[PDB]
Amino acid sequence: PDYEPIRKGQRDLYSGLN
Amino acid sequence: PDYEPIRKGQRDLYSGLN
Amino acid sequence: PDYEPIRKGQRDLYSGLN
Amino acid sequence: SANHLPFFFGNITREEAEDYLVQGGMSDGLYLLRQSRNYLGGFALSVAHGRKAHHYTIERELNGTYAIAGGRTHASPADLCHYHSQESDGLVCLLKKPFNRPQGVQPKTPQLEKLIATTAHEKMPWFHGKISREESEQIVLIGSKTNGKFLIRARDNNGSYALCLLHEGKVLHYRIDKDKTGKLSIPEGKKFDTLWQLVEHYSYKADGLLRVLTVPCQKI
Amino acid sequence: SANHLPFFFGNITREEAEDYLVQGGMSDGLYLLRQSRNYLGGFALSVAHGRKAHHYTIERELNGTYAIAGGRTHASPADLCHYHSQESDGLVCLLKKPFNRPQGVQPKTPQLEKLIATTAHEKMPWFHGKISREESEQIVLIGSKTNGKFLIRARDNNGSYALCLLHEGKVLHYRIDKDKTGKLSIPEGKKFDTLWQLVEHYSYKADGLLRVLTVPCQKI
Amino acid sequence: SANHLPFFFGNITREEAEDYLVQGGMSDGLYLLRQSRNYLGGFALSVAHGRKAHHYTIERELNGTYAIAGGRTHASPADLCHYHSQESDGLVCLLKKPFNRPQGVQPKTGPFEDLKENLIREYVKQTWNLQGQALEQAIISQKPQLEKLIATTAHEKMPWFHGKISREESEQIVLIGSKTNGKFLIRARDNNGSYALCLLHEGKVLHYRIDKDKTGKLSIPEGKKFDTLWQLVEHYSYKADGLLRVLTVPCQKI
């Protein structure tokens, strides 16, 4: 009937090659 | 002149007979 | 570009003479 | 001295109990007996039923007999148990299986006792004798503005007192009174025989108060 | 078990890592190796360059060999580094100086791993087999209402579980799903191969949840 | 060094004191002397008048004399007390009783009154390259002025102070690593003139402006005013007093 949504602000990103 | 009401929604009530 | 402002009303000030 | 009772767990929070019960099976009829913490010399019955728990408090009759108010008076909680183990009589259900005191676990911890307690708060820090409603605010806004700092002062009798505490800089007053039975309790709130009790508890669970009690506001 | 490697710190977090770096010099070419926490038996490489920090995730190739996605596959993490120390190869930079396990410090705590993991929760306090969205509410609201109490129950799409936790007396349900890759992750959030790992994470940083996981709801 | 005065409590908080006085009786004319925390070498006089508390800042007059601005300048604070003990003179009231340091309690020492005393002993052995017994002298001899120096510039060595830096060079360096709240640092947005305060609040980086006013006194606009930052910090890292929160941990410098 209702699930809770998230909060972007606290998101660690990973570095890629090239 | 003004006292704080209790927030009923938050009380661990007690069961009663019958 | 933008500094955070205060809430002065909550200032412990120091009594003065007179 | 319900200590010989294998399903009796000294002073246990209502929470701790409910825990023991699911950790016990949560099987309809599962029950356990703990000491009360808001009625002198009384107890509480914790019974599982319908996947929910039900707490019943067993007041001690002046006669020295025990009885959940409204029902027959039994000689000992021991008896009470057995009897309710065969007769629903008011209870949501029959008391099938007791929840004995787990391996190792022990119980947590005439008239004089009646007194001492009623008036114990008298010597306790949070208790600031007779004082104005303002005498207070100020006395509490002074110094450490830690949240939940509190104290309780009397109003004109030895029947009406009040609860003052700090919440986000503001001070909140909660009316306390002694009803017909000599049972103190904020309006619509839990009921106790005394305050060291009243506090002990509201210092442990908000149970309605905008926050819980913390540090005893200092007295002059 | 890259334990031998002196610039290797067990289960450390991205952050705990980024600190060690600056407390290490944050000098370009500075790096250290730690275990990845969302990718089974793989690793993570963090290197100092441009005063900022660079995290590389070293995945374990089914061949038992490891290789940051998109590049050559090396025998063991130790080599990968020996090789990237003379070769940039997409790597933002050269791996000049490693950061060794500070005096005293220890590391924080081929296929089996990948097994027991996806399925370890099966035996975990916080994991409650298959259960209604209600049987939970209940079981969760019972006992101590300490905030942040949680548990995971599997829905019925067997590769689909759910998250339940306590926040201000209210129970919260967060949907969990195994995407096309067989990797679980809350809609819009970080992805892990298992839960014992998904949890271990979110019970460290909200990373989007209304609060952090705390205590595992007791199971009957 | 007011330490002989039994009603002197080293570095105590304004509140911490306010308590002592109630613990004292809040009886009109009750006072206690405490060291100031935002004015070099000056003090603070706290007194009970009408169940309320009144705080006075005894600043240190260049002449070596002390005086709450506006009034006569006295030899020592004890005198000033002795004096106000018989003459209101602008003061809410006379000082009847002093509140003495309760049994056992000793004067509070800041977290650097301890540092400093050595900090310089160091400066000295270094710049003056002397030691043994030579060192002992120089300091007791020179001491008096040195303090005013080491102080105004000690933050230069403190972890929370990150030299001259970009507004963003900051954002970043604080976001890096542990995002524990109330993480802060101060960067000069200009050599010695004014600086800036940055701290973490709910993953958000906050920049509060700091400046040296006419008097050479730093103060967040609308905020308390300090001699040094070492002082400034030590305070806000105790009570928000305006900030959306209090300072916790000193963001680390690269």
CA distance F196 to D187: 51
- The residues that bridge with E177 in the sheet, in sequence order, are E185
CA distance F46 to F33: 6
CB contact under 8 A, D22 and E218: yes
Helix axes F113-127, F134-152, angle to 10 degrees: 120
The answer to whether E92 contacts chain A (CB < 8 Å) is yes
CA distance E60 to E62: 6
- What number does CATH give the domain F109-153? 1.10.930.10
Q: Is chain D adjacent to chain F, meaning 3+ CB pairs within 8 angstroms?
A: yes
Instruction: List the one residue out of F85, F58, F92, F86 whose CA is nearest residue F72.
Output: F58
**What part of E 168-187 touches A (C-beta under 8 Å)?**
172-175, 186-187
- Establish whether domains F109-153 and F154-254 are of one fold: no
Chain F closest-CA separation from residue C6 CA (Å)? 5
Strands E177-178 and F8-9: unpaired
CA distance E21 to E28: 10
CA distance B11 to B7: 8
* 3-class SS of residue E198: helix
Superfamily of domain E126-220: SH2 domain (3.30.505.10)
C interface toward F at CB cutoff 8 Å?
A: 1-4, 6-8, 10-12, 14-18
Measured between CA atoms, the residue of chain A closest to residue F176 is A12
- The residues that bridge with E108 in the sheet, in sequence order, are none
CB contact under 8 A, E70 and A17: yes
- The residues that bridge with F67 in the sheet, in sequence order, are F59
- Which residues in chain D touch residue E135, judged by CB atoms under 8 angstroms apart? 51
Chain B closest-CA separation from residue D209 CA (Å)? 6
The sheet that has D170-176: what strands, in order across it? D127-130, D150-154, D161-167, D170-176
Instruction: List the one residue out of F64, F61, F5, F65 whose CA is nearest residue F35.
Output: F5
Answer for the pair D216, D126: CB distance below 8 angstroms, yes or no: yes
CB contact under 8 A, D22 and E145: no
Resolution of the PDB structure in angstroms: 3.0
CA distance F254 to D12: 52
Name, in order, each residue with C-beta under 8 angstroms of D52's C-beta and a sequence gap of 6 or more: E138, E142
Q: How many CB atoms lie within 10 A of CB E122?
A: 12
Domain F1-108 coded CATH 3.30.505.10: yes
> Encoding tokens for residue E80?
């990968």
Measured between CA atoms, the residue of chain A closest to residue E190 is A11
The 8-class DSSP code of residue B11 comes to -
Q: Is chain A adjacent to chain B, meaning 3+ CB pairs within 8 angstroms?
A: no
Answer for the pair F251, F186: CB distance below 8 angstroms, yes or no: no
Q: Annotate E69-131 with DSSP letters as a single string.
A: TTS--BSSHHHHHHHHTT--TTSSS----B----TT-------HHHHHHHTTGGG-TTEEEE-
Q: How many CB atoms lie within 10 A of CB D50?
A: 11
Domain boundary assignment for chain D: 1-101, 126-220
CA distance E180 to D153: 65
**What part of F 103-132 touches C (C-beta under 8 Å)?**
none
Instruction: List the one residue out of D17, D3, D36 whose CA is nearest residue D107.
Output: D3
Instruction: List the one residue out of E170, E144, B8 whose CA is nearest residue D190.
Output: B8
User: Helices in chain E by DSSP H: which ranges?
Assistant: 14-22, 77-84, 112-118, 133-141, 195-202
Token pair 């505490």 in the structure block, residue: D165
CA distance E57 to E66: 10
CA distance E169 to E164: 13
Q: How many CB atoms lie within 10 A of CB E50?
A: 10
Name, in order, each residue with C-beta under 8 angstroms of D215's C-beta and a sequence gap of 6 or more: D144, D146, D148, D149, D150
CB contact under 8 A, F177 and E26: no
E65-104 burial code (b ≥16 CB/10 A, e <16)? ebbbeebeebeebbebbeebeeeeeebbebbebbbebeee
CA distance F226 to F235: 9
For chain B, the C-alpha Rg in angstroms (whole number) is 13
Pick from C4, C8, C15: CB nearest F54: C15
CA distance D30 to E104: 52
- Which residues in chain E touch residue F253, judged by CB atoms under 8 angstroms apart? 22
- Distance (Å) of CA F35 to CA D122, E51, F39, F84, F217: 37, 42, 9, 18, 18
CB contact under 8 A, F243 and C17: no
Domain E1-101 coded CATH 3.30.505.10: yes
Strands F30-35 and F8-9: parallel
- Which residues in chain E touch residue F172, judged by CB atoms under 8 angstroms apart? 51-52
The answer to whether E139 contacts chain D (CB < 8 Å) is yes
Q: Which of E13, E21, E55 to mutate to test the interface with A (most CBs of A within 10 A)?
A: E55
Is the CA virtual torsion F12, F13, F15, F18 positive or negative?
Answer: positive
For chain A, the C-alpha Rg in angstroms (whole number) is 14
Chain E closest-CA separation from residue D137 CA (Å)? 28
Instruction: List the one residue out of F48, F68, A1 whose CA is nearest residue C16.
Output: F68
The answer to whether D132 contacts chain F (CB < 8 Å) is no
Q: How many CB atoms lie within 10 A of CB D24?
A: 22
* 3-class SS of residue F139: helix
CA angle E26, F186, F158 (to 5 degrees): 70
CB contact under 8 A, D57 and B7: no
Q: Is chain A adjacent to chain C, meaning 3+ CB pairs within 8 angstroms?
A: no
CA distance E10 to F101: 52
The 8-class DSSP code of residue E192 comes to B
> Encoding tokens for residue D73?
């008076």
Answer for the pair E177, A6: CB distance below 8 angstroms, yes or no: no
Answer for the pair E162, E127: CB distance below 8 angstroms, yes or no: no
Instruction: List the one residue out of F201, F174, F172, F169 whose CA is nearest residue F185.
Output: F174
Domain F154-254 coded CATH 3.30.505.10: yes
* 3-class SS of residue F179: coil
CA distance E17 to E200: 17
